[PDB]
Amino acid sequence: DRINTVRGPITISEAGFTLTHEHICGSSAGFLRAWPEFFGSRAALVEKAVRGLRRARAAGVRTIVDVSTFDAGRDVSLLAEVSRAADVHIVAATGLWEDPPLSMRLRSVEELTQFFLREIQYGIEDTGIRAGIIKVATQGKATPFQELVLRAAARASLATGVPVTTHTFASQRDGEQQAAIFESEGLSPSRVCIGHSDDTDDLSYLTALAARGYLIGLDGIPHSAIGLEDNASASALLGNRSWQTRALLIKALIDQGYMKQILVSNDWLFGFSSYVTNIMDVMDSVNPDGMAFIPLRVIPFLREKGVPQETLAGITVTNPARFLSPTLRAS
Amino acid sequence: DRINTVRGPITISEAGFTLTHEHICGSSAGFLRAWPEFFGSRAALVEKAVRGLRRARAAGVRTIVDVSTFDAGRDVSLLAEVSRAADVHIVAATGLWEDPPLSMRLRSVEELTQFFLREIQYGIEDTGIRAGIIKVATQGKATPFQELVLRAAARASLATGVPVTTHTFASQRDGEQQAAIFESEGLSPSRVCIGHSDDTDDLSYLTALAARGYLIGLDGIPHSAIGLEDNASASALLGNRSWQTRALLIKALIDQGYMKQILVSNDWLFGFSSYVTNIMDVMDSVNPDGMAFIPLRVIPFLREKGVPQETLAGITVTNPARFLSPT
Ligand SMILES: C[C@H](CCC(=O)O)C(=O)O
Ligand SMILES: C[C@H](CCC(=O)O)C(=O)O
Ligand SMILES: [Zn+2]
Ligand SMILES: [Zn+2]
Ligand SMILES: [Zn+2]
Ligand SMILES: [Zn+2]
């Protein structure tokens, strides 16, 4: 009946329009508490995030999934404050992203499983806030540690029913190795979203995973450095493909019969310290609408291409509800 | 006249017997808060650290310098709790160690200088606790980022007078490159402790540094895997040299005229999550005295070798006071 948020359980019906891959703040563990002035101030970051979430809410968003892990500087107390003030539901994540510290990198698959279970079953830190999704990452072929993370995520998912979502190098077809490892642990593809899949134009790679039951995370639609060609750091981060090109992958998967496997998001954030210093300012200049980009820009774009509104509502409301609803625990 | 501790400012005379390179808990940023069960529980880690610090206090220790940085999982609230319950002063550190996250690795020398200054001049996190030392690290030739960290540490030291202490690969003579970079920033060697220097047996490396005015950190005296030869991970971390061999480097530098530039410590910890899982139990099994090892074992070892008590008081009381006092 219920999904865990940073404010407690909500019914599946209350989730509504859901962005399945977002960040309040992309940072590092302990960084926001040790150096809040990097973001101007903690209060400034809160105000910026609350305004951004209110803008998404006015455009119809009711829930976001914050896929920031421990090592991406997830601060669940910040998410809770920002969720309350904006009245947008936020689902928090466990797992590990691309910057685990030594204290994570040295751990066994059994130990990592216990850590992920702790954040789902007991709570994150001392807040009692329970994670509602598990996030994992590869950047090409998995390192041995990344394999352990994938297996621990699958084991925690099976034990708790909460879904798994991933970071990929889509152009290296990362989803295929991730799928192989998840299936070796007996995880159902319908409980796995292969994320950053709009970073590639290889439809055959995406449709092969979708045909296997995997969810395809088309989650970075406004990520584009067009017009920023002189900015090496922004170009490397955001790529030189247009948001229209990324958005047309949504239509392509619909046209090929895979609507039920699509999830869409912005992969936006309101603070960003794990990259070059000016990057949040640059991104905000590109996409002032922030997390409202999906409802304000992608939906009207696809509507005029002929995608029916009921199909778009199914992708943005029903598909995330099915994904986030916990399934039965194993045993 | 004042040194910043996790309980506030203290005067120089209050420091007393001081261990200049120690850790309450060797971890990673955010880890103790996110996964306290790794240590049994936060309360169990507190109780273990308080018992261990009380044992060091009974052996004569009055102050320790916790050289855990942000990325070594420094939790200054934990330091404060344990300091208060064992009545041992704890000086906290800023700087960066060998595991900086992306949000640190991407920063400029100017940005890093601002961060180090913040923890010294303003306070750590939202606690108001101010750092009294800057910790830096190399493992062989400095990476480009480590060069930035060394320069930012020099700039923060020059602006505040707080000293700099280093992690080295002593057997690659890292202190020479660290000194070169510090001096290129105009930092005085008397503000710098070249640490882990007991990891090497090359006396000529240490005496040349000391003849340039650097302090020499013989800070890992009880680190030894003798008797643990079937344990690859403990052997790799602790080395196969005896504590006596490390302790004899103290006597050698005294015999060569450098008693006023020696700093001695244990480099012990009460929790340890940044290595293999069993490592803290292993270390405790060979050194139950923990941080009391220096006063309970090294001081009698040197006294039998003929070092007068005045010299040992100078090394354990006078040198740390001079080093930590802001200049
Ligand atoms: C902006 C954003 C946050 C992190 C992520 O999705 O890997 C990104 O993709 O870098
Ligand atoms: C025991 C200790 C803590 C970290 C350090 O001093 O680099 C160590 O030396 O590993
Ligand atoms: Zn990602
Ligand atoms: Zn993301
Ligand atoms: Zn060290
Ligand atoms: Zn140390």
Curated annotation (Swiss-Prot), chain B:
Organism lineage string: Bacteria, Pseudomonadati, Pseudomonadota, Alphaproteobacteria, Caulobacterales
Protein name: Parathion hydrolase
Entry membrane topology: Peripheral membrane protein
PTM annotation, UniProt: Predicted to be exported by the Tat system. The position of the signal peptide cleavage has been experimentally proven.
Principal EC category: hydrolase
Subcellular location: Cell membrane
The keyword Membrane belongs to this UniProt entry's keyword annotation: yes
Manner of cofactor binding, per the entry note: Binds 2 Zn(2+) ions per subunit.
Keywords: Cell membrane, Hydrolase, Membrane, Metal-binding, Plasmid, Signal, Zinc
Family (UniProt): Belongs to the metallo-dependent hydrolases superfamily. Phosphotriesterase family.
Organism the protein comes from: Brevundimonas diminuta (Pseudomonas diminuta)
PROSITE patterns in the cross-refs: PHOSPHOTRIESTERASE_1, PHOSPHOTRIESTERASE_2, TAT
EC nos: 3.1.8.1
